């Protein structure tokens, strides 16, 4: 028979505290970074968590796509962690499921990320599986052909949300170059896709100076010493189509959209490279948070709006801070007027309580992004890929050291720059486009 | 040929030479049905598509 001691009772003398308590480190751990002799940068941060997260960041995404290889990042999200030169798909799946580890492939607009999350006792297995699935991937014909269907329903489901479509068209209108390409493409774009297209895209994006290995809860010396023979990469840097902000306006026609969506955006100058400008953009995003759901079942009523959803994206060298607001189909001009009034009242000055509230909201978001080990590893990897360092302490200091005059100056400089304007839905009521982009001038 | 020989032998009388030949024919019938068909067939598959 099995154990019969009930869980309200303590387990018997075969329940030992044989591992002693290890003493805590004296200070909060710092991020330690170096570079391999192949040129791949390795950055890691130690944690007290029992979960180690390993993520591999490669420059690419929608910004590295061509018209021939259109939608290759979305296919790479599904086709990753399959048969390699050393393991089959069955062997990799069983080796991940044996240690209880999880894998993801995640494609941004300027990068693709591959990651394995496991416990602290299986970090060598996770590192070896991740490196083998990234470096030595095969991308066989039949597996890509069978994955294309699931890619098509995942894109079709992701395009059901109007905010995703508005974000795509807004990035198209705001930028010319790499950042204007479409991430969530139409399903019919990848109808002629083959494994040669994915192999061509992977050969373009892969280079030793465009790959960053980020780890959370892993010793740095051990990680470099055991990843030197695994991340010895070769290849040439395919040219990157640098993007520029130009602004403009566009439209979308949706036949059975029960609402109408309006997007307004500006450029965050400096991109992710400038700490202060990104902090000010995050504060502006929090200042535009009209209906934040801080409590269950709370009903904040607006006169015109149905939903408000701001954002602040910080790419390399340039950014895009703005707001998307919904509304009734017959009240779209009122939605535009209210959005312009909100940005103009922000430019008229912020009043102490709002500044403190938005600073606390930005600090809470920044600290809750890095609370878990996979989130911290992703943040370290993205920051090192975009800049060369992780500066969360400096970002928190910039958020806390922000005055109302600096924010008012930031919004004043924003409204002088030409904006980006996108509509959506069965558009049967709209003010003319010339008067749309006049209220900030 | 083995099966037709067994058909011919059944209409004869019992004789030591016919007993010996019938025993050899029965042994070869079992040998073909149980040894030639799996093993020679596997060798043919290894020759053709191996």
């Amino acid at each position: 028979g099995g154990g019969r001691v009930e869980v309200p009772l303590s387990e018997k003398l075969p329940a030992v505290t044989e591992p002693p308590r290890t003493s805590t480190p004296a200070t909060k751990p710092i991020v330690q970074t170096s570079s391999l002799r192949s040129g791949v940068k390795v950055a890691s941060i130690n944690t007290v968590s029992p979960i180690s997260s390993l993520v591999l960041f490669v420059e690419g995404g929608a910004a590295a796509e061509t018209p021939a290889t259109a939608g290759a990042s979305k296919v790479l999200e599904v086709a990753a962690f399959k048969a390699t030169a050393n393991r089959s798909t069955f062997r990799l799946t069983r080796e991940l499921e044996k240690i209880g580890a999880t894998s993801f492939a995640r494609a941004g607009r300027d990068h693709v990320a591959f990651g394995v999350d496991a416990t602290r006792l299986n970090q060598l297995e996770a590192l070896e599986i991740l490196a083998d699935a990234v470096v030595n991937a095969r991308y066989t014909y039949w597996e890509v052909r069978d994955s294309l269907d699931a890619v098509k329903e995942q894109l079709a489901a992701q395009l059901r949300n109007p905010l995703t479509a508005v974000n795509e068209v807004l990035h198209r209108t705001a930028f010319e170059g790499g950042l204007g390409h479409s991430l969530v493409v139409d399903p019919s774009v990848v109808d002629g896709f083959t494994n040669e297209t994915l192999k061509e895209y992977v050969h373009s994006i892969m280079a030793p100076s465009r790959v960053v290995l980020a780890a959370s809860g892993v010793d740095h010396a051990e990680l470099t010493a055991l990843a030197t023979p695994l991340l010895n990469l070769h290849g040439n840097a395919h040219p990157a189509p640098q993007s520029r902000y130009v602004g403009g306006a566009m439209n979308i026609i949706a036949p059975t959209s029960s609402l109408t969506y309006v997007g307004l955006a500006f450029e965050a100058k400096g991109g992710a490279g400038d700490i202060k400008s990104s902090a000010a953009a995050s504060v502006v995003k929090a200042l535009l948070d009209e209906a934040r759901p801080t409590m269950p079942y709370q009903r904040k009523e607006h006169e015109v709006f149905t939903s408000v959803n701001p954002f602040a994206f910080a790419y390399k060298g340039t950014g895009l801070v703005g707001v998307v607001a919904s509304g009734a189909p017959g009240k779209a001009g009122k939605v535009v007027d209210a959005l312009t009034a909100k940005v103009q009242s922000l430019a008229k000055g912020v009043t102490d309580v709002q500044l403190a509230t938005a600073k606390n909201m930005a600090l809470g978001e920044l600290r809750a992004s890095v609370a878990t080990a996979p989130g911290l590893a992703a943040a370290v990897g993205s920051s090192v890929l975009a800049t060369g360092k992780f500066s969360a302490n400096e970002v928190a200091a910039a958020l806390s050291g922000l005055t109302a005059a600096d924010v008012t100056s930031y919004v004043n400089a924003m409204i002088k720059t030409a904006p980006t304007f996108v509509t959506y839905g069965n558009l049967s009521s709209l003010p003319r486009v010339d008067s749309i982009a006049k209220r900030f001038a | 040929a083995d099966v037709l020989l067994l058909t011919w032998l059944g209409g004869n009388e019992i004789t030591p030479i016919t007993s010996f030949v019938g025993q050899c024919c029965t042994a070869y019938l079992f040998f073909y049905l149980l040894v030639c068909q799996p093993l020679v067939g596997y060798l043919e598959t290894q020759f053709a598509h191996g």
């Binding site: 069955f90 014909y141 039949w142 | 053709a48």
Partner: protein, 122 residues
């Protein structure tokens, strides 16, 4: 017996080459390849490996099969100009089928069955 087995390996190669030459001479009169003899209804590993091929290869295989069946119905052979171009030992199915069989061997050592069944028509 390993020393006699080492002597039997060039013997195995010699009998394999002689068999392949004779059968390929018999095969080329119908335009068939060696890989065209494998039947999906007979073997589920072949049925799965044929599913992993690009469609032009399957079209070419089906055309060769129909040509050979027409020749068999006519009790004829290929013309000599066409018969001189035949290459019955050109492989299109061997690597795919080998990888399918290796996958089925690797799954069986851990207790897993094959992820494909026999073909049923009912």
């Amino acid at each position: 017996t390993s020393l006699l087995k080492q002597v039997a390996l060039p013997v195995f190669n010699s009998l394999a080459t002689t068999y392949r030459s004779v059968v390929g001479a018999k095969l080329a009169k119908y335009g068939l390849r060696f890989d065209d003899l494998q039947d999906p209804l007979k073997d589920e590993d072949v049925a799965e490996a044929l599913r992993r091929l690009p469609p032009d290869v399957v079209v070419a295989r089906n055309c060769r099969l129909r040509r050979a069946l027409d020749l068999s119905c006519k009790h004829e052979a290929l013309p000599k100009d066409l018969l001189e171009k035949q290459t019955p030992e050109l492989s299109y199915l061997q690597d795919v089928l080998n990888e399918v069989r290796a996958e089925r061997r690797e799954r069986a050592q851990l207790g897993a069955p094959a992820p494909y069944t026999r073909i049923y028509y009912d």
